[PDB]
């Protein structure tokens, strides 16, 4: 299948996993500022657009780390081989959003073909989930482009066993020499530590700072 | 009455409303910095005081948007025609707070008469709710004037169907050329999207930037 | 014993206490930036290290205020005479953390002897709680040294009657003339108001700004 059954008895965080999944169920959010000065220059010298690039770069970082691709399936801890981004789409006419997903690809050009195509087919589709059920192997990416925020947190009544990372971006802004993007990351404590979140962000910063292709 | 029964079957966010009210109950908070450089100048050239002005400006923005005045009454979704601010009051002697409310008025001078009068009557009243029950048509405004914060979030055990926006301000501070006020907004996802929150903040920023009268 | 039964009927926040402990159970988090320019200079001129100093200074501020040392014991509200820090320890080999605690002492040198000794004994102990049960009189201190954050919030499924403050620090960073440390404080509303949190932070800032000995 497109996942592997994870070895829970020989894993180093096995005590942690049960602690934060059942004894003390919890998660955490942290918002950090990502330096997008270099990425703006690269976007500038290409035909790619900001949102799709951020989706692609977020999914790329997510797909490099096992702990951000965890889930429970048939009462077992699995690791997705790969995850596809589920992102929000604003409808300026209705002032409502839809949530769309498209296959992740390592090739940035193929990713762009996927995004545009799905963006093509459901552009004016105001259902909350135009495509139907959300793929099991997903990551959530949202965007708040109209306002800059220093912090964002989702207060959820019931989060038992939902391990997919929640990522939210705000409007970027010039802070002296740098163009900074606020990025909120919300994770479940059973599968992720502060280290795992820092790693992802640091990795995401690297990617912003590198050639697109 | 002072409210209108909202048309839920012909509303564009009807799927959203049920999704986030029952399938996935949740809310979110975001803290943004409001530029109060212009407002400080206007306060300077008047006799008005900062807290009352912020209460008045917050209630004014809130009263312009339907989605921030929503509630459930007799198991139905209503929109308040208008809402009155319920704000916190610090008692320096006891080191405790009370929560007071006063009628909103479009006329800033009449608002000030209301605030001073209620502030007059319950100045030394250390009950948590001096006035009695909190009016159904309300908004919550709190202030933390002793410390600046980049983020604030209320972790509530049970928030089912409480749709009134929660607004919290921190101590303002000079960030170069600007006087910035941290403002945390906490809302329920059933009635508000990220767009609706951005709109409010952008509108609030406009108001700070305009004549008081 | 090492605690005193608190006088709930003659306390000024008694209505507040029941309100936020049972009628409206909730807490809040706030992240503020602590100016550590002065502390860096003092660390520089000594042999002490940053994490241990921050633990010591956090526990010192906490031990000055009753409301941050509250608990329920045998269904009664107690105040700990004193609390010991429980802090996280990263294991670079396994990439997992443990939580350790050591006795608080007013003497900074004795504190350092305690920390090093416990750090000595369980350096390579990868259990989540190497020492066993966590002392009842504790405070939680965590650190995220790999990334800077503007906000941090723990989303906990069940927090009834746990009154110990949760403090989390991020990687510090140069913001012009200042070295700023992000510090998230998470508290239960029954025992702490915004005032009580501001007071702690202001007190913590003072301590950073003062001689170590
Ligand atoms: O609800 C969704 N997204 C919103 C958009 O504002 C938000 O990002 C969110 C994501 C996950 C979530 N959860 O899993 O509890 C709650 C809200 C998607 Cl699942 Cl459609
Ligand atoms: O509790 C109140 N205010 C506090 C003050 O610190 C805070 O602003 C708050 C507001 C709303 C709330 N809620 O609705 O769950 C909880 C806390 C008012 Cl309802 Cl009196
Ligand atoms: O879980 C713990 N610490 C984590 C570390 O990331 C976090 O600081 C935390 C603290 C308290 C908590 N709680 O009491 O619900 C939850 C998480 C300690 Cl109790 Cl070991
Ligand atoms: Co279990
Ligand atoms: Co792979
Ligand atoms: Co329903
Ligand atoms: Co009107
Ligand atoms: Co009770
Ligand atoms: Co003492």
XYZ file of C-alpha atoms and ligand atoms in Angstrom:
705
model
C 0.000 0.000 0.000
C 0.979 3.733 0.104
C 1.940 3.526 3.837
C 4.066 1.359 6.184
C 2.965 -0.059 9.603
C 5.299 1.786 12.070
C 7.407 -0.147 14.618
C 5.980 1.178 17.889
C 7.685 -1.334 20.352
C 11.328 -0.468 19.118
C 10.702 3.297 18.647
C 12.500 5.672 21.012
C 9.345 7.958 21.622
C 7.072 4.996 22.435
C 6.573 6.115 26.027
C 5.915 9.681 24.776
C 3.421 8.458 22.168
C 1.180 6.711 24.747
C 1.706 9.546 27.269
C 0.419 12.304 24.928
C -2.030 10.181 23.055
C -3.947 8.786 26.068
C -2.602 9.846 29.535
C -2.220 13.564 28.729
C -3.811 14.159 25.229
C -2.506 17.398 23.817
C -1.005 19.341 21.001
C 0.618 22.714 20.514
C 0.864 25.536 17.980
C 3.755 27.904 17.397
C 3.953 30.753 14.906
C 7.373 31.683 13.600
C 8.481 34.199 10.983
C 9.949 32.722 7.814
C 12.424 34.897 5.937
C 11.067 35.128 2.401
C 13.484 37.736 1.041
C 15.307 35.112 -1.125
C 12.061 33.418 -2.361
C 10.572 36.744 -3.529
C 13.694 37.272 -5.731
C 13.368 33.721 -7.187
C 9.565 34.152 -7.789
C 10.427 37.486 -9.467
C 12.765 35.705 -11.919
C 10.145 33.049 -12.823
C 6.516 32.682 -13.810
C 5.522 30.835 -10.630
C 3.095 32.435 -8.148
C 3.471 32.740 -4.383
C 0.604 30.555 -2.975
C 1.299 27.480 -5.152
C 5.049 27.771 -4.415
C 4.380 27.933 -0.621
C 2.031 24.901 -0.876
C 4.746 23.017 -2.877
C 7.566 23.989 -0.408
C 5.401 23.120 2.663
C 4.477 19.706 1.186
C 8.149 19.155 0.209
C 9.344 19.767 3.851
C 6.466 17.659 5.213
C 7.384 14.731 2.859
C 10.961 14.632 4.169
C 9.923 13.815 7.775
C 8.047 10.675 8.930
C 6.601 12.155 12.156
C 4.537 14.695 10.139
C 2.995 11.895 8.010
C 1.658 9.743 10.876
C -1.811 8.358 11.298
C -3.895 5.718 12.938
C -5.492 3.118 10.471
C -7.277 -0.031 11.648
C -6.172 0.937 15.134
C -2.458 1.012 14.123
C 0.207 3.678 13.736
C 1.170 4.109 10.098
C 3.516 6.401 8.227
C 2.349 7.636 4.858
C 4.906 7.070 2.104
C 3.739 10.444 0.791
C 1.125 13.181 1.546
C -0.826 15.602 -0.703
C -1.574 19.165 0.326
C -5.100 20.195 1.091
C -5.233 23.994 0.892
C -7.916 26.678 1.163
C -9.283 28.611 -1.835
C -11.116 31.918 -1.432
C -14.153 32.744 -3.592
C -14.195 36.570 -3.882
C -17.827 36.535 -5.143
C -19.377 34.652 -2.235
C -16.700 35.532 0.330
C -16.476 31.861 1.343
C -13.682 29.283 1.068
C -13.398 25.735 -0.276
C -10.634 23.275 0.569
C -8.921 21.613 -2.473
C -6.144 18.998 -2.757
C -3.843 17.944 -5.576
C -1.124 15.279 -5.859
C 2.270 16.208 -4.541
C 5.155 15.785 -7.021
C 8.881 16.286 -6.447
C 9.054 17.945 -9.847
C 7.893 21.582 -9.206
C 6.645 21.901 -12.836
C 4.443 18.805 -12.548
C 3.105 20.104 -9.206
C 2.137 23.418 -10.957
C 0.293 21.445 -13.732
C -1.652 19.579 -10.938
C -2.530 22.795 -9.006
C -3.674 24.759 -12.125
C -5.696 21.840 -13.431
C -7.585 21.406 -10.059
C -7.877 25.200 -9.736
C -9.334 25.065 -13.315
C -11.957 22.397 -12.612
C -13.310 23.894 -9.299
C -12.624 27.606 -9.506
C -16.289 28.498 -9.057
C -17.268 25.472 -6.993
C -18.486 26.845 -3.687
C -18.948 23.465 -1.880
C -16.763 23.198 1.153
C -15.094 20.028 -0.344
C -15.710 20.239 -4.146
C -13.736 17.061 -4.887
C -15.494 14.889 -2.244
C -13.826 13.107 0.694
C -10.368 14.376 1.719
C -7.578 11.900 0.968
C -6.312 10.117 4.069
C -2.670 11.043 3.236
C -2.992 14.831 3.524
C -1.524 17.925 5.213
C -3.667 21.121 5.850
C -2.437 24.423 4.537
C -4.474 27.579 4.949
C -3.807 31.149 4.163
C -4.910 34.468 5.624
C -3.553 36.900 2.948
C -5.510 39.959 4.096
C -3.820 40.593 7.494
C -0.509 39.907 9.176
C -0.633 38.140 12.487
C 2.036 37.289 15.062
C 0.130 34.284 16.302
C -2.694 31.940 15.173
C -4.155 29.020 17.169
C -7.116 26.662 16.301
C -9.101 25.833 19.490
C -10.658 22.422 18.619
C -13.235 20.687 20.886
C -12.123 17.170 19.905
C -8.758 16.250 18.347
C -8.230 12.630 19.412
C -5.810 10.755 17.004
C -5.716 13.369 14.184
C -1.979 13.644 13.548
C -1.859 15.655 10.311
C 0.017 18.942 10.755
C -2.080 22.115 10.413
C -0.097 24.966 8.729
C -1.462 28.527 8.378
C 0.219 31.524 6.670
C -0.611 35.240 7.100
C 0.086 38.267 4.859
C 3.911 38.797 4.583
C 5.536 42.055 5.515
C 8.668 44.130 5.270
C 10.537 44.227 8.562
C 13.540 46.334 7.606
C 15.766 44.375 5.199
C 13.626 41.290 5.255
C 10.301 40.161 3.835
C 8.872 37.973 6.650
C 6.060 35.436 6.377
C 4.228 34.478 9.654
C 3.677 30.690 9.712
C 1.628 28.939 12.357
C 2.242 25.124 12.748
C -0.283 23.149 14.906
C 0.584 19.532 15.791
C -0.472 16.753 18.100
C 1.988 15.973 20.924
C 1.772 12.179 20.493
C 3.763 12.205 17.207
C 5.654 15.569 17.408
C 7.960 17.258 19.917
C 9.159 20.943 19.836
C 12.313 19.577 18.158
C 10.284 18.050 15.294
C 8.486 21.388 14.706
C 11.740 23.423 14.858
C 13.309 20.966 12.336
C 10.434 21.421 9.859
C 10.574 25.216 10.117
C 14.395 25.264 9.755
C 14.056 22.901 6.777
C 11.262 25.137 5.312
C 13.485 28.245 5.719
C 16.283 26.359 3.817
C 13.928 25.588 0.962
C 12.763 29.166 0.659
C 16.451 30.073 0.427
C 17.286 27.624 -2.439
C 16.730 27.330 -6.207
C 13.232 26.376 -7.189
C 14.677 24.231 -9.999
C -37.300 42.737 18.739
C -33.627 43.927 18.769
C -32.515 41.022 16.483
C -33.522 39.369 13.170
C -33.927 35.581 12.539
C -31.100 34.843 10.009
C -31.827 33.062 6.698
C -29.746 29.900 7.106
C -31.098 27.888 4.040
C -30.177 30.717 1.453
C -26.875 31.736 3.138
C -23.655 30.981 1.260
C -21.744 29.637 4.436
C -24.580 27.272 5.423
C -22.465 24.177 4.831
C -19.599 25.818 6.782
C -21.908 26.756 9.663
C -23.042 23.142 10.278
C -19.513 21.816 9.597
C -17.835 23.957 12.307
C -20.752 24.062 14.650
C -21.374 20.288 14.905
C -19.104 18.072 12.694
C -15.813 19.801 13.589
C -16.573 22.326 16.450
C -13.798 24.866 16.621
C -12.655 28.419 16.805
C -9.420 30.317 16.384
C -7.534 33.292 17.811
C -5.099 35.580 16.036
C -3.181 38.504 17.496
C -2.254 41.317 15.151
C -0.564 44.660 15.759
C -2.750 47.715 15.236
C -0.961 50.913 14.263
C -2.042 53.485 16.836
C 0.308 56.306 15.832
C -2.592 58.368 14.335
C -5.013 57.676 17.265
C -2.459 58.837 19.868
C -2.232 62.213 18.018
C -6.071 62.524 17.947
C -6.372 61.535 21.681
C -3.652 64.142 22.370
C -5.779 66.868 20.729
C -8.914 65.930 22.734
C -10.064 65.166 26.252
C -10.933 61.533 25.505
C -8.978 58.701 27.168
C -7.455 55.636 25.524
C -9.453 52.679 27.019
C -12.933 54.167 26.420
C -11.917 55.184 22.868
C -10.662 51.617 22.112
C -13.909 50.139 23.541
C -15.940 52.607 21.371
C -13.866 51.871 18.185
C -14.010 48.062 18.773
C -17.807 48.170 19.280
C -18.133 50.458 16.214
C -16.249 47.922 13.959
C -18.192 45.018 15.501
C -21.558 46.790 14.805
C -20.752 47.141 11.097
C -20.525 43.355 10.494
C -23.365 40.819 10.954
C -21.156 37.725 11.435
C -19.687 39.201 14.666
C -23.196 39.759 16.121
C -24.498 36.185 15.719
C -26.137 34.019 18.317
C -28.383 31.086 18.912
C -31.820 31.963 20.591
C -34.650 29.445 20.959
C -32.493 27.089 18.933
C -32.235 29.570 16.000
C -29.491 31.659 14.431
C -30.101 35.352 15.017
C -28.218 38.517 14.186
C -28.278 41.255 16.781
C -29.329 44.620 15.363
C -26.731 46.055 17.743
C -24.279 44.918 20.497
C -22.978 46.618 23.682
C -19.409 46.225 24.874
C -18.680 44.295 28.008
C -15.192 45.293 29.162
C -12.951 44.538 32.141
C -12.265 47.028 34.956
C -9.281 46.663 37.284
C -9.599 47.452 41.005
C -6.102 48.576 42.117
C -7.026 48.127 45.822
C -8.090 44.487 45.663
C -6.092 43.585 42.546
C -9.191 41.943 41.046
C -11.318 42.774 37.994
C -15.036 43.248 37.337
C -16.704 43.113 33.931
C -18.991 46.117 33.097
C -21.159 46.940 30.055
C -22.723 50.141 28.766
C -24.946 50.927 25.763
C -23.197 51.432 22.476
C -23.982 54.731 20.700
C -22.825 55.928 17.282
C -22.313 59.361 18.796
C -18.853 59.150 20.520
C -19.866 61.869 23.053
C -22.984 59.964 24.134
C -20.893 56.772 24.431
C -18.463 58.660 26.779
C -21.441 59.847 28.951
C -22.578 56.143 29.192
C -19.068 54.825 30.080
C -18.361 57.523 32.747
C -21.789 57.129 34.299
C -21.392 53.275 34.639
C -17.766 53.748 35.742
C -19.219 56.228 38.327
C -21.860 53.880 39.741
C -19.594 50.753 40.111
C -16.080 52.086 40.512
C -15.599 50.342 43.853
C -17.925 47.418 43.204
C -15.759 44.326 43.426
C -18.427 41.765 42.320
C -17.426 39.979 39.181
C -20.648 41.263 37.437
C -21.731 44.377 39.440
C -24.681 45.128 37.143
C -26.128 41.564 37.195
C -26.650 39.290 34.170
C -24.665 40.157 31.020
C -26.848 41.427 28.173
C -27.374 38.838 25.450
C -26.271 41.330 22.731
C -22.666 41.820 23.871
C -19.028 41.683 22.719
C -16.117 40.955 25.210
C -13.261 43.392 25.427
C -10.445 42.898 27.897
C -7.248 44.696 28.491
C -3.820 43.718 29.780
C -2.194 47.200 30.165
C 0.775 46.073 32.267
C 2.670 43.966 29.666
C 3.006 43.743 25.911
C 2.372 40.383 24.358
C 2.746 39.068 20.807
C 0.055 36.477 21.297
C -2.886 35.720 23.646
C -5.199 32.676 23.480
C -8.090 31.630 25.854
C -8.134 27.804 26.247
C -11.824 27.113 27.098
C -13.091 23.632 28.131
C -16.552 24.147 26.608
C -17.449 26.728 23.937
C -20.442 25.182 22.158
C -22.632 27.882 20.403
C -21.053 30.996 22.018
C -20.486 33.205 18.977
C -19.600 36.554 20.569
C -16.118 37.725 19.558
C -13.530 37.868 22.363
C -11.113 40.845 21.929
C -8.064 41.399 24.179
C -5.559 44.302 24.062
C -2.045 44.434 25.585
C 0.187 47.392 26.552
C 1.118 49.383 23.365
C 4.693 50.014 22.391
C 6.991 52.041 20.204
C 8.372 49.978 17.345
C 10.459 52.579 15.542
C 8.164 55.178 13.940
C 4.993 53.504 15.055
C 3.033 53.071 18.266
C 1.669 49.493 17.957
C -1.182 47.948 19.932
C -1.299 44.080 20.123
C -4.913 42.917 19.637
C -6.004 39.326 20.055
C -9.381 38.360 18.397
C -10.900 34.941 19.363
C -13.901 33.697 17.347
C -15.927 30.583 16.741
C -15.436 28.978 13.303
C -19.165 28.383 12.696
C -19.905 32.111 12.129
C -16.424 33.518 11.214
C -13.734 32.695 8.654
C -10.135 34.131 8.544
C -11.518 36.623 5.993
C -14.130 37.912 8.476
C -11.425 38.436 11.145
C -9.023 40.158 8.692
C -11.911 42.461 7.595
C -12.654 43.513 11.193
C -8.990 44.226 11.932
C -8.539 46.178 8.658
C -11.742 48.092 9.460
C -10.484 48.704 13.064
C -7.134 50.013 11.711
C -9.124 52.430 9.430
C -11.067 53.749 12.392
C -7.961 54.347 14.451
C -6.680 56.328 11.465
C -9.769 58.624 11.154
C -11.308 61.616 12.963
C -12.989 60.766 16.213
C -15.692 63.342 15.410
C 3.672 20.391 56.032
C 5.299 22.203 53.036
C 2.001 24.001 52.146
C -0.732 26.090 53.849
C -4.543 25.592 53.485
C -5.649 28.835 51.699
C -8.464 31.011 53.116
C -11.022 30.805 50.305
C -14.062 32.447 52.133
C -12.094 35.758 52.976
C -10.157 35.923 49.659
C -11.020 38.761 47.277
C -11.022 36.482 44.060
C -13.318 33.865 45.636
C -16.124 34.564 43.178
C -13.579 34.456 40.312
C -12.104 31.171 41.555
C -15.459 29.313 41.430
C -16.439 31.102 38.187
C -13.347 29.941 36.230
C -12.906 26.674 38.005
C -16.457 25.312 37.514
C -18.925 27.698 35.734
C -16.572 28.715 32.898
C -13.402 26.474 33.164
C -10.585 28.093 31.261
C -7.035 29.242 31.069
C -4.944 31.425 28.808
C -1.444 31.669 27.348
C 0.478 34.786 26.401
C 3.945 35.002 24.887
C 5.975 38.101 25.631
C 9.536 39.062 24.741
C 11.943 39.298 27.662
C 14.884 41.652 27.228
C 17.963 39.537 27.899
C 20.617 42.068 26.879
C 21.688 42.624 30.546
C 21.632 38.870 31.460
C 23.889 37.947 28.511
C 26.508 40.445 29.842
C 26.257 38.947 33.382
C 26.462 35.323 32.028
C 29.498 36.481 29.999
C 31.252 37.644 33.196
C 30.576 34.340 35.027
C 30.810 30.595 34.569
C 27.044 30.038 34.703
C 25.174 28.757 31.625
C 21.985 30.132 30.092
C 19.406 27.290 30.582
C 20.142 26.679 34.293
C 20.116 30.455 34.948
C 16.699 30.824 33.200
C 15.319 27.850 35.207
C 16.677 29.457 38.447
C 15.264 32.956 37.576
C 11.852 31.498 36.525
C 11.597 29.465 39.764
C 12.736 32.538 41.762
C 9.900 34.725 40.264
C 7.394 31.877 40.701
C 8.381 31.465 44.417
C 7.652 35.133 45.148
C 3.937 34.881 44.210
C 1.313 32.683 45.941
C -1.141 32.484 43.004
C 1.463 30.623 40.874
C 1.968 27.988 43.621
C -1.693 26.957 44.030
C -3.131 23.485 43.993
C -6.005 21.330 45.043
C -5.120 18.603 47.723
C -7.754 16.494 49.483
C -10.312 18.638 47.702
C -8.870 21.889 49.177
C -7.028 24.912 47.827
C -3.458 24.996 49.092
C -0.491 27.258 48.513
C 2.890 25.597 48.304
C 5.462 27.171 50.618
C 7.912 26.525 47.780
C 8.045 24.895 44.285
C 10.822 23.055 42.380
C 11.314 23.438 38.648
C 10.587 20.558 36.355
C 12.363 21.263 33.062
C 12.896 19.434 29.770
C 16.215 17.840 28.750
C 17.011 16.987 25.131
C 18.881 13.779 24.247
C 20.763 14.553 20.993
C 21.382 10.815 20.344
C 17.768 9.658 20.433
C 16.211 13.025 19.564
C 13.775 12.640 22.473
C 13.305 14.598 25.709
C 13.037 13.703 29.398
C 11.611 15.943 32.110
C 13.859 16.396 35.222
C 13.379 18.327 38.489
C 15.768 19.532 41.172
C 15.258 21.396 44.465
C 14.934 25.133 44.237
C 17.367 27.118 46.427
C 17.572 30.878 46.951
C 21.343 30.566 46.804
C 22.158 30.481 43.021
C 25.373 28.464 43.684
C 23.499 25.751 45.594
C 20.879 25.640 42.806
C 23.723 25.056 40.246
C 25.116 22.165 42.412
C 21.559 20.612 42.404
C 21.078 21.022 38.603
C 24.548 19.614 37.672
C 24.201 16.708 40.069
C 20.742 15.685 38.614
C 22.027 16.372 35.084
C 24.973 14.067 36.060
C 22.853 11.163 37.309
C 20.340 11.077 34.355
C 22.197 12.529 31.399
C 21.677 9.407 29.300
C 18.409 8.308 30.880
C 15.870 8.318 28.078
C 12.753 7.558 30.226
C 10.223 10.315 30.032
C 10.441 10.770 33.882
C 13.850 9.278 34.902
C 13.430 10.208 38.576
C 9.903 8.721 38.950
C 6.743 10.618 39.955
C 6.835 14.420 39.556
C 6.834 16.277 42.878
C 3.473 17.836 43.696
C 5.108 21.262 44.339
C 6.417 21.910 40.818
C 6.420 24.433 37.952
C 6.917 23.322 34.246
C 9.663 24.911 32.227
C 10.360 23.833 28.673
C 12.671 25.089 26.049
C 12.625 25.192 22.260
C 16.238 26.353 21.544
C 16.245 25.515 17.829
C 13.704 28.108 16.557
C 12.358 31.484 17.580
C 8.627 31.796 17.869
C 6.324 34.756 18.508
C 3.678 32.583 20.080
C 3.307 29.101 21.657
C 0.081 27.558 23.018
C -0.548 24.010 24.467
C -4.024 22.760 23.395
C -4.906 20.286 26.209
C -8.023 18.037 26.082
C -8.489 18.018 29.870
C -7.029 20.571 32.307
C -9.449 20.497 35.250
C -7.762 21.727 38.538
C -4.114 21.708 37.318
C -2.920 25.121 38.488
C 0.847 24.882 37.957
C 2.103 27.518 35.508
C 3.473 26.197 32.198
C 6.461 28.294 30.947
C 8.104 27.750 27.531
C 11.135 29.591 26.067
C 12.217 29.782 22.396
C 15.604 30.571 20.791
C 16.597 34.217 21.633
C 17.368 36.735 18.952
C 18.897 40.096 18.213
C 16.246 42.706 17.506
C 18.405 45.774 16.960
C 20.029 46.802 20.260
C 18.377 44.090 22.264
C 18.715 40.347 22.727
C 15.072 39.209 23.156
C 13.855 35.910 24.591
C 10.265 34.796 23.647
C 8.529 33.416 26.766
C 5.139 31.753 26.680
C 3.250 31.545 30.068
C 0.136 29.261 30.206
C -2.076 29.461 33.319
C -5.467 28.408 34.568
C -7.990 31.253 34.987
C -9.247 30.061 38.396
C -6.025 31.106 40.210
C -4.518 33.713 37.787
C -5.731 36.906 36.113
C -3.928 38.865 33.297
C -2.579 41.087 36.103
C -0.941 38.103 37.853
C 0.759 37.039 34.583
C 1.931 40.605 33.771
C 3.356 40.872 37.342
C 5.376 37.651 36.949
C 6.777 38.728 33.579
C 7.641 42.236 34.873
C 9.255 40.617 37.929
C 11.137 38.140 35.632
C 12.396 41.051 33.463
C 13.677 42.762 36.694
C 15.584 39.649 37.677
C 17.218 39.307 34.291
C 18.312 42.924 34.744
C 19.950 42.415 38.204
C 23.121 40.872 39.671
C 23.118 37.116 39.766
C 24.916 37.266 43.131
O -11.323 23.191 8.281
C -10.399 23.257 7.487
N -9.544 24.264 7.440
C -9.605 25.427 8.320
C -9.637 26.661 7.475
O -9.761 27.866 8.182
C -8.568 25.365 9.411
O -7.330 25.521 8.717
C -8.668 24.034 10.143
C -7.877 22.957 9.793
C -7.922 21.790 10.504
C -8.807 21.745 11.603
N -8.821 20.476 12.349
O -8.305 19.489 11.875
O -9.387 20.523 13.451
C -9.582 22.781 11.961
C -9.533 23.916 11.240
C -10.096 22.157 6.440
Cl -10.201 20.614 7.162
Cl -11.316 22.362 5.180
O -14.448 36.054 31.690
C -14.511 37.156 31.172
N -13.463 37.794 30.679
C -12.102 37.268 30.704
C -11.213 38.280 31.356
O -9.875 37.888 31.511
C -11.675 36.740 29.358
O -11.579 37.909 28.546
C -12.708 35.748 28.843
C -13.723 36.142 27.991
C -14.602 35.230 27.475
C -14.418 33.881 27.851
N -15.377 32.928 27.268
O -16.383 33.334 26.731
O -15.063 31.735 27.382
C -13.437 33.479 28.675
C -12.592 34.394 29.184
C -15.833 37.946 31.008
Cl -17.069 36.912 30.446
Cl -16.202 38.577 32.615
O 4.581 17.225 29.130
C 5.445 17.908 29.655
N 6.031 18.932 29.061
C 5.731 19.367 27.700
C 7.007 19.410 26.921
O 6.869 19.752 25.567
C 4.868 20.603 27.680
O 5.724 21.626 28.188
C 3.634 20.386 28.543
C 3.597 20.791 29.864
C 2.459 20.657 30.609
C 1.336 20.093 29.965
N 0.126 19.975 30.797
O 0.201 20.112 31.997
O -0.916 19.732 30.172
C 1.351 19.696 28.683
C 2.485 19.823 27.970
C 5.956 17.672 31.098
Cl 4.640 17.399 32.150
Cl 7.004 16.256 30.997
Co -3.304 3.863 26.099
Co 10.061 9.980 0.479
Co -25.901 19.393 13.073
Co -26.406 48.909 12.084
Co -18.489 24.783 42.012
Co 8.855 32.276 50.293
